[PDB]
Design a protein around this ligand. Structure first.
Ligand SMILES: OC[C@H]1O[C@@H]2O[C@H]3[C@H](O)[C@@H](O)[C@@H](O[C@H]4[C@H](O)[C@@H](O)[C@@H](O[C@H]5[C@H](O)[C@@H](O)[C@@H](O[C@H]6[C@H](O)[C@@H](O)[C@@H](O[C@H]7[C@H](O)[C@@H](O)[C@@H](O[C@H]8[C@H](O)[C@@H](O)[C@@H](O[C@H]1[C@H](O)[C@H]2O)O[C@@H]8CO)O[C@@H]7CO)O[C@@H]6CO)O[C@@H]5CO)O[C@@H]4CO)O[C@@H]3CO
Ligand SMILES: OC[C@H]1O[C@@H]2O[C@H]3[C@H](O)[C@@H](O)[C@@H](O[C@H]4[C@H](O)[C@@H](O)[C@@H](O[C@H]5[C@H](O)[C@@H](O)[C@@H](O[C@H]6[C@H](O)[C@@H](O)[C@@H](O[C@H]7[C@H](O)[C@@H](O)[C@@H](O[C@H]8[C@H](O)[C@@H](O)[C@@H](O[C@H]1[C@H](O)[C@H]2O)O[C@@H]8CO)O[C@@H]7CO)O[C@@H]6CO)O[C@@H]5CO)O[C@@H]4CO)O[C@@H]3CO
Lengths: 585, 585
């Protein structure tokens, strides 16, 4: 067994409390060397002469290089010391604990989880566990009052291909008008890109953080929205740009005019004094040459409490959660006090983050509830749209990703197909709607949160910025009603089959040749299976049972396939068919 | 190269700012697998036209199974994305990064440290980095004035063997009368175990957290000690137990007497109503049957502030530093708002934890500055006292422990050789003053802060609680002043030799058989190498020269070793000799 490959930390994504009294320890080994891992543990003071309690660590997934095992250690005493007895394939047993490896128990040492306090059990809003979000880019979703329109609006048409700045006017009233659509699809929260008052077509140059931008609406319209949507099941989540300010911020203007005398001077990172906002962008901004975005000093206790009052206004207004823009470039202490502030104004206001590098520093329990799952985006483009990885690599990428984070985070990362910065996922499959559908049949059953972009329930293609941002096609003859009844089908299925939302994922079948991949999602007795054929030709496959039991297994999209031959469930599936097979339990 | 053994993270101990412009990055690798390690880096938002800057990661030492590479990335924009070019023994060029491993750069991805903040550069009290702390267990240091006493006391001579009941007097005025000793020895801080009012001889069931124990002193004798010591550059660091409270304590009294009526019911977890002092003792405890100490539920806002009010108060008294006992079972929120407090009251207040399992989750820079280094306590017990580990395992335990936490946390850890509950180091050393002297030459040059116990300067031998709490031996005639002048000289070297306090430690020779281990301390051109023949015989060893250079070294304990024979430096050293060779620059 090569022991420099076995890994565990008593911190972090490898040990964490699911409850006061229940601890979760995970361990990884090179693919194949550990064939049995079993935790032996006791309270942190229990005297030697006692036999230990025991709990077997299951295999929870194997990515490309490592096999990942996971066990559940009851700690009634809310304190736990433990060692792993690891067992090889050729039978070698070893013991792993803090001292190192040994084959003689004690000299392994012992790992320890100091105390488990309920304030450190990572707790995320129960609602977000079964949600499906709908990303609204408000400017392109609908224009419901023509009076707000910026001058020069282009005509709304399925014709449109935009340019960078080009406005189409789309506004909070429009959304208010189209809420009886959103509601039928079965969405449960809308996530607006930034709506606040700002100079450009995209509101990232924030000018006043405390008011809806002039082209979108006004606080009573935002309330009428918050209120009309909540009453329809839908929550409202806002985009929070606290990293950097815009050029028309008060404090950026005060430093601009007064310079060194303004009581705002230290709010921003200063070499360009006086402010040259036109010729030398060297004053800490977004990145070295953007001259209209200077960074707010989140460290400063005035800056901090301003953005906390920004955060409280918007929550007086009724919102259920923020998505945090460029979260990773504002300090952890801000994000902690932020979590403290938010979660007290609203027990269920979610705080979700955007960082596109490993985000575990924030998914520890104390800063955000989940981040945007970029790794699912990469995996789904490649497997489903470009073809470039095969089900084995699919499984590897999937599997390496979910063990990034505590399961409280993983189970609710926002699983996005595309965004207002990417080419649109139908362009990604180059127009092929069988690929697109399979990628959605995946999205709606995997672990985390379906995030639909505006437009894809009805078929919109596009390139990256600005071409994803074409107006939404709202005429029922111009919309792929085929797709819509599928999103509504799947969405319904996500909402009744408790395991799809709240259940764990285990890999069932990964066949690089035929390109099928199939998973099970499980809560208690229930098992649903998702068999996905990523082939444009039709395949039988044979597969083995899920552990417990199922002689008979319904298909929820279509009817019975009780083919459980005592261990072989045999199933044919036509091109790009996914099947979602439910225990019946 | 086993790829499963390569580790790096962009958090924690494996990457962290040393300044806002500079990020230390560390990488762990199976021993022997990797020969050159190098970090190639650019700013996060840098475009691909640019060459990546290069930075070579030297071998920072190798523990039993792993080598460790460590590099320094000058990141001017405070943002860094980095790919490692690993280079191995046959010549395999591997690229490591977040995406994974590939022989092509782009398929490896890049790790990211998003932005580096002044608030997140771990800062430590600058005195503490040179300090030599003197451990007093007050009750036995000396007796000042017998109006302290608690009727029962026993005699002040060498002969007297403490039983667990006893009191020998021992009080803060003795320590005042004793400071010119402390000033002569050369210590720079004094850390007193608990002195707060309590009903027992272990004051850890602190009964009155706001007042010194009757038997020890009063607030002006304390506050006179604090002054009289500042005058001699000796600082008071004090043991605080915020984990459990005492039975007799004010806020608890109110449920001994008040049942549910008790406002203070929620400061405490209470299993079994009421206080079962006598019936059976299970109620949230330090341990399994320990009877006076129920858990201070620090999580509670109304507790927390009290335990912050204690700390305001003892800091109004002018104390410099807390050592916080059984720290590991109180919440990271307590610790972290406590650190903000202490450091805002006094920017220089040392804050030191006591965890006896890996404590990295408090050694980030938001929580404490160091723990008690129990590894040092056991790694010297083996190499020096017991003879049960040779030079190559001493080197390995040392390196496996000094790569565990960020560097700032590692140069202030308390290097104790014994405590009031352990055996006295001469008694482990077997009484051999020659073995002991060598383990002190080491503690005084090793990375960390030297903790002297009261009495080891004078050769006090002793055993577990009680024998190690024996009175100090104050008669010149019964003191090993031969030891006292040796400790006195090392504490002087450490304070004149920059690298002994603030440099880094690279092992120079570790030879299993000869049992001679040797190391180098370094800051800028200055190198100071300590050669230790830990073998009872006189060997001659030939060391290879260190990186800046040194054709000629002076030995600080005795005179000139110009043995620099074209790289080789020949040293003939006597039994149990440690040399301290200062490279002259
Ligand atoms: O006031 C309490 C006490 O707090 C401090 O103790 C800290 C100590 O300084 C640190 O070193 C550390 O302790 C950890 C220790 O290092 C580890 O080795 C391990 O401890 C285990 C023991 O090694 C193991 O032997 C066993 O314990 C059983 C004992 O063997 C057995 O003798 C008996 O224990 C009783 C003692 O005999 C008795 O004397 C008593 O202790 C009183 C002390 O004498 C007195 O000085 C004082 O101690 C302070 C101490 O000065 C601080 O350093 O009060 C004590 C109580 O009034 O009581 C013991 C019964 O509880 O029974 C035990 C168990 O049946 O197992 C342990 C656990 O595996 O882990 C230690 C825990 O971290 O940290 C502690 C603070 O946590
Ligand atoms: O206002 C800024 C911006 O904020 C938001 O963007 C956030 C986004 O949601 C996060 O995902 C993230 O960004 C990371 C990004 O996702 C990664 O892809 C990577 O990005 C790299 C690109 O993949 C790579 O192609 C290249 O980028 C070069 C471009 O190819 C090149 O064209 C040029 O980019 C210019 C744009 O073309 C131009 O349109 C303009 O961008 C403006 C947008 O059009 C406008 O919508 C808005 O942008 C918001 C965005 O909507 C939010 O979602 O403002 C933009 C600026 O005014 O100007 C660009 C300037 O050159 O140059 C780039 C090289 O810089 O490289 C990148 C990086 O290597 O990594 C990203 C960082 O990890 O964070 C952003 C917020 O920071």
């Amino acid at each position: 067994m090569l022991l420099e490959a076995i890994f565990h930390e008593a911190k972090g994504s490898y040990a964490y409390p699911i409850s006061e009294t229940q601890l979760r320890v995970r361990l990884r080994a090179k693919k194949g060397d550990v064939v049995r891992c079993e935790v032996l543990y006791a309270d942190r003071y229990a005297s030697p002469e006692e036999e230990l309690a025991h709990a077997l660590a299951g295999k929870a997934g194997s990515d490309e290089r490592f096999d990942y095992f996971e066990a559940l250690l009851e700690c009634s005493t809310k304190r736990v010391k433990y060692v792993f007895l690891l067992t090889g394939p050729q039978g070698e047993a070893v013991y792993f604990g803090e001292t190192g490896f040994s084959a003689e128990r004690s000299k392994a040492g012992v790992f320890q989880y100091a105390y488990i306090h309920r304030s450190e059990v990572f707790t995320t809003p129960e609602w977000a566990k079964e949600a499906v979000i709908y990303q609204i880019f408000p400017e392109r979703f609908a224009n419901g009052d023509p009076s707000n329109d910026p001058p020069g609006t282009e005509q709304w048409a399925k014709d449109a291909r935009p340019r960078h700045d080009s406005f189409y006017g789309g506004d909070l009233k429009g959304v208010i008008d189209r809420l009886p659509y959103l509601e039928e699809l079965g969405v449960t929260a809308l996530y607006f890109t930034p709506i606040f008052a700002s100079p450009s077509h995209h509101k990232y140059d924030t000018a006043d953080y405390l008011a809806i931008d002039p082209q979108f609406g006004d606080l009573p319209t935002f309330r009428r929205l918050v209120d009309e949507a909540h009453r329809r099941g839908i929550k409202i989540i806002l985009d929070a740009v606290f990293n950097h300010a815009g050029d028309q911020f008060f404090a950026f203007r005060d430093v601009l005019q007064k310079g060194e005398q303004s009581r705002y001077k230290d709010w921003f990172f200063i070499e360009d004094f006086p402010v040259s906002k036109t010729s030398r962008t060297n004053y800490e901004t977004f990145a070295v040459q953007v001259p209209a975005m200077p960074k707010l000093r989140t460290e400063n206790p005035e800056v901090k409490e301003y953005l906390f009052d920004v955060a409280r206004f918007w929550m007086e207004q009724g919102i259920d959660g923020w998505r945090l823009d460029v979260a990773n470039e504002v300090d952890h202490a801000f994000w902690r006090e932020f979590r403290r502030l938010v979660k007290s104004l609203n027990p269920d206001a979610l705080i979700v983050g955007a960082i596109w590098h490993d985000a575990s520093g924030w998914l520890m329990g104390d800063q955000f509830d989940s981040v945007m799952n970029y790794l699912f985006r990469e995996s789904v483009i490649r497997f489903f749209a470009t073809g470039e990885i095969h089900a084995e690599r699919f499984d590897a990428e999937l599997t390496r990703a979910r063990m990034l984070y505590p399961e409280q985070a993983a189970q609710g990362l926002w699983n996005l197909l595309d965004s207002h910065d990417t080419e649109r996922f139908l362009t990604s499959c180059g127009g092929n709607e069988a690929k697109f559908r399979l990628a959605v049949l995946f999205q709606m059953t995997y672990l985390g949160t379906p995030l639909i972009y505006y437009g894809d329930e009805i078929g919109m293609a596009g390139a990256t910025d600005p071409d994803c941002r074409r107006p939404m096609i709202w005429e029922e003859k111009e919309q792929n009603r085929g797709l819509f009844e599928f999103y509504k089908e799947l969405i319904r299925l996500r909402h009744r089959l408790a395991s799809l939302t709240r259940g764990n994922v285990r890999s069932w079948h990964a066949d690089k040749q035929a390109n099928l991949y199939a998973f099970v999602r499980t809560v208690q007795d229930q098992h649903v299976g998702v068999v996905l054929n990523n082939r444009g030709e039709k395949q039988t496959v044979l597969l083995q049972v899920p552990e417990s039991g199922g002689k008979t297994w319904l298909d929820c999209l279509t009817g019975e396939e009780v083919h459980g031959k005592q261990g072989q469930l045999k199933l044919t599936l036509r091109p790009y068919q996914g099947m979602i097979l439910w225990n019946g339990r």
